[PDB]
A paper describes a structure:
pmcHyperpolarization-Activated Cyclic Nucleotide-gated (HCN) channels represent a class of unique voltage-gated cation channel that are activated by membrane hyperpolarization and modulated by cyclic nucleotide and membrane lipids. HCN channels play a major role in neuronal excitability and cardiac pacemaker activity and have emerged as attractive targets for the treatment of various heart and central nervous system disorders, including heart failure, depression, neuropathic pain, and epilepsy. The recent cryo-EM structures of HCN1 (31) and HCN4 (32) unveiled a tetrameric topology, with an intracellular N-terminal domain, including the HCN domain, six transmembrane domains (TMDs), and C-terminal domain, including C-linkers and cyclic nucleotide-binding domain (CNBD), which contains the binding site of cAMP. To understand the mechanism of ligand and lipid sensing by HCN channels, we determined two cryo-EM structures of HCN3:ligand-free and cAMP-bound structures.
To investigate the conformational changes that HCN modulators induce, we performed cryo-EM analyses of full-length human HCN3 in physiological conditions which bind with cAMP. The overall structure of cAMP-HCN3 showed high similarity to the apo-HCN3 structure (RMSD = 0.529). The TMDs of cAMP-bound HCN3 closely resemble those of apo-HCN3 conformation, and the structure of TMD of HCN3 in the presence of cAMP was similar to that in its absence, indicating that addition of cAMP alone is insufficient to open the channel. The superimposition of a single subunit from the apo- and cAMP-bound structures shows that cAMP-binding causes rigid body movements of CNBD domains, resulting in a 10 Å closure of the cleft between C helix and β strand 4. Secondly, the density of CHS was not observed in cAMP-bound structures, which is consistent with the idea that CHS represents an inactivating lipid. In the cAMP-HCN3 structure, we observe a strong density that bridges the C helix and β strand 4 at the site where cAMP is expected to bind. The cAMP-binding pocket is located at a cleft between the C helix, P helix, and β strand 4, which together form the CNBD of HCN3. The cAMP-HCN3 structure reveals that the residue R543 on the C helix forms hydrogen bonds and cation–π interactions with the AMP of cAMP, primarily stabilizing the CNBD domain. The phosphate group of cAMP is pointed inward within the cAMP-binding cleft and is accommodated by residues R463, C495, and T503. Specifically, the C helix in the CNBD shifts 30 degrees.
Author numbering:
A (entry chain B), B (entry chain D), C (entry chain C): 50 to 151, 156 to 191, 205 to 476, 483 to 546
D (entry chain A): 50 to 151, 156 to 191, 205 to 475, 483 to 546
């Protein structure tokens, strides 16, 4: 009895919010009882999965059954039509109690007026069997052709199929992350295949109603008395060749109703192929945008290089810097770390600098709170070999830690080491000079952040003082 | 008598400014009297709505009347031509007094020179009936063909139609918000349909003037003596098949003037179809850009994830954070709140936090000025379960309020609660530790903003002191 | 004698810099004398304008002269060929002394090696008349066909035409601001027209060399003995119909060399039409980008509106705010004013606020230096009616000036007025409350900027004190 | 013996990191011995370069050999098939020991399960010769047609070719900077040419198996007894004309299997041509984006100009300012200098201002450390002529240096400087400076100036002496 209520699911959590909002929605459904179908409930799922398959089966089978078969009084055809009319009438009956997303669950007022204003007439016309009525109520050939065109009123179920497919596609952008362009283009492919299947049946249907004049292509190809499969094959070939703008026959089409159907199918095919090109272009432009932005940024850089007329060796030095800095990846490290929360930043920086945790003895013994408080305030820097990181007699600004590479002070030291220590404490000038031997990834620490961390932790101040005196002894 | 002046309307307000600027424009119109038509006045509306319909009627009917009908001396055709010449001459007469937007309302100088420099000759040629003049002044078949080609000079009214349609489209981007690409593409569709309707009439017109040679397609299909409708149908089929690049006849076109018309229509159709593909692509790329930017941003995030070689569980934790933070929506909350004004921000934050207003007793009794002054300085934050928001023995930085979820301090508390209070007042370390039990939306308050609000309001300082002492008792 | 040197022009100033850099380049040219042609000099202009016209004339006329005419020994044809060979040999001779932009003006070393490495062979082959040599040196039909194919070596002048057209197009992005896509697409249109004109001549040329077999289309259409114009017309129709993917004949092409030419022209036409669609799409997407960014920004805003589930009246209030703030224009007022210089900002703000200059008596008497020093520090703000700008008992933050609209303090005041005065001086709370009656554009002044301007100007401090005492009297 | 290990190369450095990480990967390979092939090693290079050429040769030659030739028992055809089966079986054998990038080098567990889960069946089917088996085991015409369709199972080597081409293309985005769209579009061109070459062979193959009915196009064109080259030419013309949406014959195709092949090739050609248009559009939009952003920015500027209804002379003054400021180049000087490191900034500013170094005597004698410390804190500014840079009786804010142009206060040209004494005296502006031409200037802020004086005390006295000299002037 709870199947009319929306259950607790991932889409339910992402739409309603917490479990309490889901319970509020369930109580709003339970305001009335067995009169309201919530539009996110599993009953609408369990119904629409049936109705989509039935609608696809009818929209494929029904024109082939109308146009190509001669004796329309076969029993399983009548059984199939009766079943289709039954389910598509029960669908409207269940629609009457259903909810409407704009979620207006007011049953006696909003539902009835929203149907009678928007989408009751089309579903009502497509639901009921019109041809059986005129058969019961009622020059026989005009009557039979009239009943055939009336039986073509079943084709308005397409408008309901489109509505349910768009409701599904609005649902499954949220339970699964899907590229939008893929959904759009497979929707368009289904529409195009369906339209070509219509035009085949139509271009056989029109010479049927005129009792095959000698001007029509069926009489010219002498294929009146073949089986329905081969006639369907030739008609579909003709329709697809008009639709993809080919050029079908030897002669121009002579009969006047052939000309206008031809022109109609040509226009429809040209517009559908144009929209298909558009969707394919929009899909292709969204494949390697991360690599494309890197390309645009380097175009911008060499534009700036050209503006100041820089030398060639400097230009390739810049190029090597970008190749060993970004590695073809155009990411904004500031905004991504800004969009996150604090524990995510802590976990990321721990995973990136557990090597610096492991090699350094000062981080081996201290509290991990202190370790994270240091690590959250570093900055990643990359140097090229031959460069002097710190020159002697500087102002003194920053400390450095060593991720990779080895560095030479004119006394060499490899990765896992550190320098820039004592000049922050003594506040003096730079004692020795540090060179870059290779590409060396470094993390840097600002002095204001350093004093803030020392204000947060007094014992590591004495630890740095002891290791600075040891460094002075070295 | 005020219909020459621009009235007070929505476009009038968005162009001129206040009502006073509209009155200044009305006085500038009333500088002269019954000699100037302001280009935004309702008289130009009331005139152009007639003239567009007349121009469309002529540009559809006139070639069909020229080419297909034999006896051109029928009375209602002459009546129709006389009416068309009358209205399109009166249009030029009313153009003489009209205003010109660049609004140059100087009648005797700017209007006359701007016509005689830019667009007087084309309207003058398209206005007057040339063929009736040569009929009055004046081997009869060459004369009749000469009059037919002279009567084709009516087709230069297209240049006026384009000018008025662009003036309308420049108007209605401002009274109604319209997607620009839709306007462009329906303008192009109208142009393409009109060009195909020209080419049908033209490809029947050329074998008319040569008295139907046996090489032409009309003689080959033996359709000289059919009605004009069927001839128009076959000619339009031929023109559309050349235009959409199909391939029309059995043979190659034999007569030399057929070949060049064929090649001309093929080139025109290829270029029009190319521009149609371009407009369709530009329309499709502007449908789901909000969802596309979210996709690009997450591609950027997983690019950054790949750059530091993060583990899988961390990567899916980041993915869950974005799914429960942005919900597929790529919006910039900083810039949108920055572009607004202060009362809009106040109304938005009141509607988002009236729940926090309702549950908290401290906000229930105080002045709503104080309530808004608190609420404008919050920050929205989202945590994942298991995370520790405040760890014991911290520095003490911020207060938190609880939108959703429940939180556990190791003493549980659900939504509508608050914490982080006493550490701002005591300026000490963190007493207890707070965990996250679920996804919990929190609003955070900075201590500097907190002290500023206390400086603005002294009594709530004592209120916070009392509730902090109560919290210490707890 | 100075025509070899680059003169002082707009492109010369935008490339070289000042007049002194132009004189340095002129001295670098005058390092040698009458041996170097600078590539920006007017002599290269005066030469290339001739050579482009000659190259276009040859690339149009020469295949029509080779393929369609029978007697190739007519005198003016020989005169035309001798003139063409003369000018295209003199072009290579003048190329030897010319300069090369990469500007390497080193004549004996860089020019000779850069020709013999890159582009000497193609120009040498296309320069000299090959067929006259084999005619002087030398089954006559094989010899004549051999001379015809040798005379087709003139077609390599296309590579020189492309080089000079790209050098021109690189020049005229700088003297005139041109949309790049227009240049690209007209270059492509010229290339496509030229290729179709080649294929017409080629598809007549191949049945010439086989003495018109009965399998070829010329013999089938029985058009061997027509004039050259009609043969050229049918050949061009055949080539264009293959190129635009149409379908030409009744039968499939029977002869084997016809099939491969057909397939070649089909592939070339398909690729050219694809690139034409691409250029048209890229041109269309760059037309109304300013209006498109406004559309995307409002999509973003209503996305944010949907995220917090805002009410409808609030949503339309936001919509009215944007309509009366930006007017469909997506401009960044911060970055544009940031990119300018100081006197440009001063001139812009003077033109926007001379009304506030004129109505205010305090700005009427003071120094215009003081006036600009005030005006450069304002901020433009827009309010909706009913809003309260200043509520009584505020903290006191800012002064306001009134561009448009009228405002009511509960004592009304219209545009050109001002308020927010005395609370900056007294540093107290807000005395009276100000409402918004209409849309009212306001300029706001911050108190820190206000005190800075008072520090710059001491007498206007006393002026504000007097008018504040007058306001207190009011 | 080290060819199974990944050597020290540029891609190796850009993937692994330092030389030590390369040695760690080499030790991880050397965990086992002569049982593991590392997927970046030169042996996989030396193997795949052979296998791509063999796969292309087979995918071109084999359908032409099957469909058009009558006697399929010629010796060099059998030799060619035996060689192809040999190398494509040895490829699977060497695949068994190979590594897999996701680098899972675990040989007995990850490799076997990853093959038997993902890509063992297709390579196994495409490897072994099926037709020779049915020939050994086994109305002869049905048997021969059955063997022909079984010999068409060689065509599944395309799936391996695609995998190796994508592995190569993933490698060479890193050793060479390549535009991605060019790689995509040449991959698509190769695929389209291959598909058209398939459809030609197929549309001749189907009337072969029906012993040429009179309804087929071969019998209608009376070309059964021509050579194989001319038959291949007509079949390829028919296939390409269906593929590029042309319209081939006089009549509609009469036989029912012709109709469905026609419709299939038409659909395939339409989709391939659509994707080709898409790739061409995406390539064209990425050519002159630097010039396009300048265009969009100036559209934005004239939008702002229109919003405040500015006069024409002001608008063209703004236009001249942008033409002499950016020169059509839409670059962000802040972010580019921000993304670099400190020595790169120092080298760039030295190369841009060595003229100011050379003309100024105060920079001629001082330490180059001081020179760079001054030069890193300048700002580039551009003025229009007639403008007054400093008006008399100002507040006093900044110093200026002169890159180009000449300025009139007592005139002075490029290489000069002003704005000096008002920073020291902290007073108002003494004289007024005009702009005579377009003049590029570098500006110096007073807070940065006092910071540099705090870093260097002797140049303080140098500025004091030259300021007293300026007062004497
Ligand atoms: N043993 C050592 N090896 C290398 N550098 C050292 C040593 N001892 C001290 N230093 C210096 O200690 C300094 C601390 O900060 P500086 O940035 O001034 O530069 C650092 C190094 O040059
Ligand atoms: N009854 C309580 N339940 C939970 N937390 C409390 C309680 N009383 C005080 N606190 C703490 O009060 C602190 C105020 O600021 P903190 O951020 O230090 O962390 C807050 C809580 O841990
Ligand atoms: N005659 C007046 N009419 C309207 N407002 C006034 C008048 N005199 C003083 N004020 C107030 O002067 C105040 C100066 O700063 P406030 O922002 O506090 O708000 C301003 C006004 O409310
Ligand atoms: N000989 C001179 N020629 C030009 N300007 C000078 C001279 N001597 C001093 N100055 C001024 O010195 C001032 C220093 O800073 P100011 O920006 O006030 O403006 C500068 C100049 O106007």
């Amino acid at each position: 009895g709870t199947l009319l209520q929306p259950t607790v699911n991932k889409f339910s959590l992402r739409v309603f919010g917490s479990h309490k909002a889901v319970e509020i929605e369930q109580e709003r459904v339970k305001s009335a009882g067995a009169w309201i179908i919530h539009p996110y409930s599993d009953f609408r799922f369990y119904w629409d999965l049936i109705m989509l398959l039935l609608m696809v089966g009818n929209l494929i089978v029904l024109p082939v059954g109308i146009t190509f078969f001669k004796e329309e009084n076969s029993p399983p055809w009548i059984v199939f039509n009766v079943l289709s009319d039954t389910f598509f009438l029960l669908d409207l009956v269940l629609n009457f109690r259903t909810g409407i997303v704009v979620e207006i669950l007011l049953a006696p007022r909003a539902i009835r007026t929203r149907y009678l204003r928007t989408w009751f007439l089309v579903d009502l016309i497509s639901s009921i069997p019109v041809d059986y009525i005129f058969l019961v109520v009622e020059r026989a050939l005009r009557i039979v052709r009239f009943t055939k065109i009336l039986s073509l009123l079943r084709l308005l179920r397409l408008s309901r199929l489109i509505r349910y497919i768009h409701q599904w596609e609005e649902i499954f952008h949220m339970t699964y992350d899907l590229a939008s362009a893929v959904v759009r283009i497979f929707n368009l492919i289904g529409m195009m295949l369906l339209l070509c299947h219509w035009d085949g049946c139509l271009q056989f249907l029109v010479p049927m109603l005129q009792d095959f004049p000698p001007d029509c292509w069926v009489s010219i190809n002498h294929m009146v008395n073949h089986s329905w499969g081969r006639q369907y094959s030739h008609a579909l070939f003709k329709a697809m060749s008009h639709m993809l703008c080919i050029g079908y026959g030897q002669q121009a089409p002579v009969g006047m109703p052939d000309v206008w159907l031809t022109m109609l199918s040509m226009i429809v095919g040209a517009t559908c192929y144009a929209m298909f090109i558009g969707h394919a272009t929009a899909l292709i432009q969204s494949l390697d945008s991360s690599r494309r932005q890197y390309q645009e940024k380097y175009k911008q850089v060499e534009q700036y290089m050209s503006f100041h007329k820089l030398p060639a060796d400097t230009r390739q030095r810049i190029h090597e810097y970008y190749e060993h800095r970004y590695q073809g990846k155009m990411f904004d490290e500031e905004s991504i770390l800004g969009e996150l929360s604090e524990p995510l930043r802590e976990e990321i920086i721990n995973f990136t600098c557990r090597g610096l945790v492991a090699h350094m003895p000062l981080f081996a013994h201290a509290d991990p709170s202190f370790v994270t408080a240091v690590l959250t305030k570093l900055r990643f820097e990359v140097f090229q070999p031959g460069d002097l990181v710190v020159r002697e007699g500087s102002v003194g600004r920053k400390m450095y830690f060593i991720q990779h590479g080895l560095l030479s002070v004119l006394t060499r030291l490899t990765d896992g080491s550190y320098f820039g220590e004592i000049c922050l404490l003594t506040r003096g000038r730079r004692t020795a000079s540090v060179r870059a031997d290779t590409y060396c990834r470094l993390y840097s620490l600002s002095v204001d952040h350093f004093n803030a961390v020392l204000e947060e932790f007094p014992m590591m101040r004495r630890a740095f003082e002891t290791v600075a005196m040891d460094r002075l002894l070295r």
